[PDB]
Amino acid sequence: YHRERSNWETQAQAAAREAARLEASRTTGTGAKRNQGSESYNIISLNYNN
Amino acid sequence: MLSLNKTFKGHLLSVANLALHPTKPILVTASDDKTWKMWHMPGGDLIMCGEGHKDWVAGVDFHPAGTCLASGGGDSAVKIWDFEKQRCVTTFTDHKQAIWSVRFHHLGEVVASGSLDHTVRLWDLPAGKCRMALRGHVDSVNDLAWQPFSSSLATASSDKTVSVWDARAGLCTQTYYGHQNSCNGVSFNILGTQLASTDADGVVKLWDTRMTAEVATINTGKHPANKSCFDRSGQVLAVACDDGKVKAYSTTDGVLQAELAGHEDAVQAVLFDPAGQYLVSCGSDNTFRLWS
Amino acid sequence: VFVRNDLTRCGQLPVRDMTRCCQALVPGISERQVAAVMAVVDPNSAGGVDYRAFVQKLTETGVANPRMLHSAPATGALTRFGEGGSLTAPD
Amino acid sequence: MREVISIHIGQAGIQVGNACWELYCLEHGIQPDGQMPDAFNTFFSETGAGKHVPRCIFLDLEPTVVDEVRTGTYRQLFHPEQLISGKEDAANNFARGHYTIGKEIVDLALDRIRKLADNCTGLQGFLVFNAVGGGTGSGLGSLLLERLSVDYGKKSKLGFTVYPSPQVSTAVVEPYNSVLSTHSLLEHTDVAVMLDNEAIYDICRRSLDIERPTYTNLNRLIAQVISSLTASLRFDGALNVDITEFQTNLVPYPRIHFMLSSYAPIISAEKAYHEQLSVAEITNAAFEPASMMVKCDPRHGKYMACCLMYRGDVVPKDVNASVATIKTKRTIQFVDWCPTGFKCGINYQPPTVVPGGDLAKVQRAVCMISNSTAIGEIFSRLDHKFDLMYAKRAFVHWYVGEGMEEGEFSEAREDLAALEKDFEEVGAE
Amino acid sequence: HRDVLKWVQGLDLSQSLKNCRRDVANGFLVAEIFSRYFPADIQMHSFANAASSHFKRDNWTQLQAFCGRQGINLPGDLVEGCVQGVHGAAIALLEHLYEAFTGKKVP
Amino acid sequence: MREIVHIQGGQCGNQIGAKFWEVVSDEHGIDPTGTYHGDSDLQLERINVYFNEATGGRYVPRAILMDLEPGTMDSVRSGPYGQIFRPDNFVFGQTGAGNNWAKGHYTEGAELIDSVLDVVRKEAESCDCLQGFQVCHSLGGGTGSGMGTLLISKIREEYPDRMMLTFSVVPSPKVSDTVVEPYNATLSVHQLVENADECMVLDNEALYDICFRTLKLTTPTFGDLNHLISAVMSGITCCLRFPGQLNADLRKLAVNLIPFPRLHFFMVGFTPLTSRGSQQYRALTVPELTQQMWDAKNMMCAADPRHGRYLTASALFRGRMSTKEVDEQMLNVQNKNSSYFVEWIPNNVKSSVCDIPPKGLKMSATFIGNSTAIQEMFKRVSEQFTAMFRRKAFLHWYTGEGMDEMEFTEAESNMNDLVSEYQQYQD
Ligand SMILES: Nc1nc2c(ncn2[C@@H]2O[C@H](COP(=O)(O)OP(=O)(O)OP(=O)(O)O)[C@@H](O)[C@H]2O)c(=O)[nH]1
Ligand SMILES: Nc1nc2c(ncn2[C@@H]2O[C@H](COP(=O)(O)OP(=O)(O)O)[C@@H](O)[C@H]2O)c(=O)[nH]1
Ligand SMILES: [Mg+2]
């Protein structure tokens, strides 16, 4: 039981680390800085970003 | 061009003998399960089945018209069944010894039958009585056949004697002792000129009607060959063996030509379809697989 | 049915209106029976719930056999599809 | 008194009977406990004091549907000895349900019928529910109806049978089972009402507006058809009909005993308030091909006789106005040798509404059961199916080894072929 | 060969031969033949059809005891070869029984 | 009331059986101690199909575990849910087959086959009416293949009217666990044709395809493959243990999936196999089950259904569903691609609806399909067998145990008989 639980814990920890990296990159805004617009306002409807 | 393409089964015990319809692609087999089953080559499925024999059905035979099928069993019973209504017309049990083989006449009126009483009897479907009984062998008559035109009846038994007879008068014309051991099956040619004898030596010997000249002598497997047949093409002779092999010997191409080892047990029946390309073989493995 | 009875395009309908909708869908539901599902779906709502949430919760919590509703008032063997030797635990 | 004995065979029989007896206990006010808090004598035999039991037997070879009645919401209603279950099912095999596994359970079935028949004084007939696409319904239903004819002579038998659909069906060997069961019900059943699940599926989708109908939805509005057939026996009305009245106005020949079915007002409550259900408007919905309970086109055939079962607030005047406007419509068509092809039956009770069904509370209703030559289309579609499979002996060794001989397939094929020939020549001008 | 195959078919045994060497190894087929030739002496009730070595030895021991009582002789070496499954011992025992029960010749 | 007797052979069958008895006893609510801890009354209604009531209220599984290696039954005692089994049914050998079909079938398996039949006869007579015999074993091994097929031959002769279920795992195309697989596989399937009423083919490298592509398991444990196998075997016997709208036992599945007697080799697959990342994004609906069921990557055999036409099919649906909307998916899948379905069988698909879903899962389905494409993984084994046997290699470890070379030509020809009759229906 300990061996197979360790195997599943390694799988779930790899998955959770990947999910945590993606969530951190989404929250801090570093990810898709290629796709991030400039000037910090909506260019179509002239309203401030939130 | 002889390989395995289709298989036909449906019997619990060993298959004793088999035959084909005279002008239809249907094979009727008689096995040790006390039944006779007809199957279709193109589909592999059964069409008709008949039961009622008390013991193992030793052999089956069909008339030239194919209306009446005879079945000789191990309980000394010869049952004649009509395929049009699936009705057993007659059940002759006058013999007290085991019956081996049957052969209908040219017109199909009467059929000769061999028993273990060292005699060959003649039975009629309408009369149901013995018309003529002949005795020319000291052992059980294993096979009987009739010529297509004349009254040349060939009887093969375990006494190593093939008897050519005139059974209408109840007399034997002559007997030939070419076989070195017991004989199980005599297969005529397309005409009545040549007859091939089976033996425990394992040789396909095709003697003449009266000259008895062995034109070709060939060897078979170690076990004794039991069943023989001649293809309608006039150049191929099929011989089963009890070692699990069916040999197709060519008359004009190097004697032995083809060997089929698809079977796994002793084969006791071999025939060729009327088309001329496919052979129907039986065996002790309860699989009457038709070779292409 | 709830959209048809909703007159203001709210997304919410009151208790009597949803009782009428439930009776239209199938006759014989009591107003108390509707209100119990109202309280289950949205506890702190003063009046009226989302009929989308109501239908969604009923369709997600519906069962095939009326016998097995009795257990309604440990995750499962097949629901994991992994940790195959970790199904249950010793002691 | 008037009494009918309902015999439900097979998985379709038990679940249709579950929905049917749910409706009948609600009509008379019988609680599921079995106690009412004189019309009930048609379907219920009042045992002593304070208890009414169904006049039914629920027989199936598999136990898995008999037991859910025994532990459902109707534990105390049914007599425990009338629900008959076996060890193993026929398993979609006509040979099993008829010869091998069905013979040892029909002897207990006839004993239960004999106790039910002797209790009732005047027995009107036997209503048989079975599925010809299954093993027990086709197989055991055959052997039971063989015994019912030889033992209870001249007593009427009505067959509300579920017949396989052309488009979609739930099994593979239904063309074998239904074709063999055709000979069983051709010579024995006095009335055979054809039900097709695909047609009831399409009825539910376009009338009740249910995109995903279920077997429970289907059996609930099959029950309204069965109830309206027997509604005149239980409750009084202007134009009373009986079981013997039902045959003599529908079947003109002994070998033609197949009829369709159509229940015209089938609406949800959102449909109901905007619909002014008049007698003429409902009767036009009865003869609509879409409202038929079997997937056949009455336009393709022609009507032979029809039966109109009206319920509720129906005056005997406007039923005749509905008949007159139907006759003048050219879309329907009648045989020339039946100039008065209508049977009208009016009852004075609106149909009951089950708490739990998709049907609304309506004031008037119509069940229309008609004999026509369009039923030759129904048998012709599975005639092509059975001839296709039997041509190369597929799915035959399951039948041959289980007692049945090979010749019973071709005899049932010729019997079905002769039934097609009768339907074509009788309606011919 | 053909004579012993005809003889074993004529008794109409429940067991089918096929591979006869493996078929007659357990002793059920030879027990059936002996029971047909002596219905009162040998019954199929006292024999177990199984591939177990102990049950095989039990069946062949009963057969040996009863045939020794009745005078019919089969080789013990052939019995050992049959229970060990060597090729040809089963065949030779079959022809020996064929000659012993109803006497004919071997070619 | 329609009892199923489970029999396991070899290292694989005991490991398959250990996960099988974990899954079934979980949805029945049976603890490893032996008591009952369920929360619904539906579990105790039909529990005698798999568990025998004992003294004190304990439930003991109807399992017979056999192997010629005695250490392997120590592994099933060591496994979880290992103390529920009766110690008497743990019939054990001493020597071990060692990947030899002949050692398990004639020489070393014969001394143990008397006691296995002793407990099978004891177990069958205890219950009221048998519904069939369920066996899970290997074909590439020596115990599950040699001793298994001798047992299947023995219990078919003694009990001829009872059904047979073989969840036999077959040797793999790509990578093989042992060299002598085609010798054991061809000899096992020769005995399976005339004995097994229906056979269900599993492959390990088809299971690895499920665990990698669909389940997104980066390192699948060897017991995770048995979880997928146990999910299917619990689904075949679904309608017996639980009520449903359309019921179908193992006999009704046999009469619909088997048009001709020798064509009883199926390939199967469990439907709602979803990863945990994609768990939240998929709507657990009936159409999402049906098209994923018919997908080639779900099926647990190496044979691809796209190559050959479907002969018959069977669907076993569990949970809250609609009968029309289940059935219309089966008519739709027969018309959108009609080339993959045989023409002389109308309505190739059978469907059953069960009302009790698996525990923790809202709705599931199980597929069984008889196809003429299953000959691809028998011609492949015949390709492996004809290479080895023609040079008579690896044969002295088979001919030393009593069998001759003629028995190899029996299985070689009978393997080629099955692929001949499957091929002529593909045309
Ligand atoms: N209309 C309707 N048909 C049903 C219902 N239940 C089952 N059926 C029909 O039953 C057919 C299947 O055959 P079954 O009735 O289940 O077979 P059986 O009578 O139980 O016989 P066995 O299966 O051998 O036990 C299907 O084609 C369905 O159309 C139902 O509740 N309503
Ligand atoms: N899916 C699966 N396959 C297994 C398992 N155990 C063994 N196998 C397979 O079975 C084959 C070997 O069978 P084996 O256990 O040695 O059979 P035996 O020696 O006859 O008892 C190998 O190809 C393995 O891949 C298991 O738990 N699950
Ligand atoms: Mg059923």
Residue F223 CA: nearest ligand 2 atom is 27
Rg, Å, chain C Cα set? 18
Sort strands F198-201 and F59-61 into parallel, antiparallel or unpaired. unpaired
- Coil, helix or strand at residue D30: coil
Q: D103-119 and D135-151 helices cross at what angle (nearest 10)? A: 50
**E14 vs B: CB within 8 A:** no
Min Cα separation D18/chain C (Å): 14
* Nearest alpha carbon, ligand 1 atom 3: D12
User: Token pair for residue B259?
Assistant: 């060997």
Judged by CB atoms closer than 8 Å, whether chains meet at F113 and E54 is answered as no
With beta carbons less than 8 A apart as the criterion, state whether D223 and D229 touch: no
Min Cα separation D393/chain B (Å): 7
Min Cα separation F347/chain D (Å): 6
- The CA-CA-CA angle for residues D120, D125, D130, to 5°, reads 115
In the DSSP assignment, the letter for residue F214 is I
Query: Which residue among D162, D204, D222 has the greatest number of ligand 1 atoms within 8 angstroms of its CB, and so is best to mutate?
Result: D162
With beta carbons less than 8 A apart as the criterion, state whether B185 and B199 touch: no
Method: cryo-EM
Torsion region of B118: left, alpha or beta (phi above 0 gives left; psi -120 to 50 gives alpha): left
Residues whose CB is less than 8 angstroms from the CB of residue D202 and which lie 6 or more positions away in sequence, other chains included: D290, D295
User: Token pair for residue F301?
Assistant: 């055999």
DSSP string, A5-47: HHHHHHHHHHHHHHHHHHHHHHHHS-TTSSS--STTB-SSS--
- Least CA distance to D269: which residue of chain C? C24
Nearest CA among F178, F173, F170 for reference residue F148: F170
Q: D375-390 and D174-186 helices cross at what angle (nearest 10)? A: 130
User: Token pair for residue B85?
Assistant: 């209504």
Residue E84, classified by CB atoms within 10 Å of its CB into exposed (0-12), middle (13-18) or buried (19+), is exposed
Type of residue found at E56:
K
- What is the distance between the terminal CA atoms of chain E, rounded to a whole angstrom? 9
Judged by CB atoms closer than 8 Å, whether chains meet at D355 and C4 is answered as no
**Of D245, D275, D288, D420, which residue is the catalytic one?**
D245
Residue C26, classified by CB atoms within 10 Å of its CB into exposed (0-12), middle (13-18) or buried (19+), is middle
Nearest to B56 among E12, E19, E107 (CB): E12
- How far is it, in rounded angstroms, from Cα F15 to Cα F407? 31
Total length of chain F = 427
Q: How many Cβ contacts (< 8 angstroms) between chains E and F?
A: 20
Phi and psi torsions of B104, nearest 5°: -80, 160
Type of residue found at C80:
R
Residue whose entry in the numeric block shows the structure tokens 């689904």: F235
Nearest CA among E95, E102, E57 for reference residue E79: E57
CA distances from B247 to B8, B255, F238 (A): 20, 11, 54
Nearest CA among D57, D42, D8, D19 for reference residue D223: D19
Helix or strand holding residue F269 (H, E): strand F265-270
CA distances from D108 to A11, B178, B252, D85, D153 (A): 61, 72, 74, 10, 20
User: Token pair for residue C6?
Assistant: 């909703």
Min Cα separation D384/chain F (Å): 10
With beta carbons less than 8 A apart as the criterion, state whether D397 and D405 touch: no
Nearest to F417 among B7, B244, B261 (CB): B7
In the DSSP assignment, the letter for residue B224 is P
Q: Which residues line ligand 1 (CB under 6 A)?
A: D 10-12, 15-16, 60-62, 89-92, 131, 133-137, 162, 169-171, 197, 215, 218-219; F 252
Judged by CB atoms closer than 8 Å, whether chains meet at F217 and A14 is answered as no
F334 is in an annotated binding site: no
Structural gaps in chain C: residues followed by a C–N separation over 2.5 Å: 73
- How far is it, in rounded angstroms, from Cα D419 to Cα E88? 64
DSSP string, E14-73: SS--SSHHHHSTTSHHHHHHHHHH-TTT--GGG------HHHHHHHHHHHHHHHHHH---
Judged by CB atoms closer than 8 Å, whether chains meet at B56 and E19 is answered as no
With beta carbons less than 8 A apart as the criterion, state whether B244 and B264 touch: yes
Judged by CB atoms closer than 8 Å, whether chains meet at C85 and A3 is answered as yes
- How far is it, in rounded angstroms, from Cα F211 to Cα A3? 19
Provide the b/e sequence for D148-172 (b: ≥16 CB within 10 Å): beeebeebbbbbbbbbbbbebbbbb
User: How remote is the C-alpha of F356 from its chain's centroid?
Assistant: 22
- For residue C4, the chain D residues in CB contact (below 8 A) are 270
Q: C15-25 and C31-41 helices cross at what angle (nearest 10)? A: 110
Does chain B reach chain F with at least 3 CB pairs under 8 Å? Answer: yes
- For residue E5, the chain B residues in CB contact (below 8 A) are 14, 266, 268, 284
Cβ–ligand 2 distance for F53 under 6 Å, the answer no
* Nearest alpha carbon, ligand 2 atom 14: F141
In D276-415, which ranges are E strands?
A: 303-312, 342-346, 364-372
Interface of A with C in 10-29 (CB under 8 A): 11
**C62 vs D: CB within 8 A:** no
D62 is in an annotated binding site: yes
Residue D245 among the catalytic residues: yes
Total length of chain E = 107
D197 is in an annotated binding site: yes
DSSP string, C64-83: S-GGGGTT-----STTT-S-
Residue D141 CA: nearest ligand 1 atom is 19
Sort strands C12-13 and D44-46 into parallel, antiparallel or unpaired. unpaired
- For residue D173, the chain F residues in CB contact (below 8 A) are 255-256
* Nearest alpha carbon, ligand 1 atom 25: D89
- How far is it, in rounded angstroms, from Cα A11 to Cα F377? 33
Dihedral, CA of residue D413, residue D418, residue D419 and residue D421, to nearest 10: 130
- How far is it, in rounded angstroms, from Cα D120 to Cα D375? 35
- How far is it, in rounded angstroms, from Cα A42 to Cα A48? 6
Q: How many Cβ contacts (< 8 angstroms) between chains A and F?
A: 13
Judged by CB atoms closer than 8 Å, whether chains meet at C1 and D73 is answered as no
Helix or strand holding residue D9 (H, E): strand D3-9
- The CA-CA-CA angle for residues B231, B233, B239, to 5°, reads 25
With beta carbons less than 8 A apart as the criterion, state whether F202 and F268 touch: yes
Phi and psi torsions of E87, nearest 5°: -75, 125
Nearest CA among F389, F420, F413 for reference residue F183: F389
- How far is it, in rounded angstroms, from Cα F2 to Cα E94? 45
**A1 vs C: CB within 8 A:** yes
How many A from CA of F230 to the centre of ligand 2? 15
**In chain C, what's the furthest Cα-to-Cα distance?**
59
Q: Which neighbouring-strand residues pair with F371?
A: F310
Judged by CB atoms closer than 8 Å, whether chains meet at C86 and A4 is answered as yes
- Least CA distance to A2: which residue of chain C? C86
Q: Which ligand is nearest to the CA of D12?
A: 1
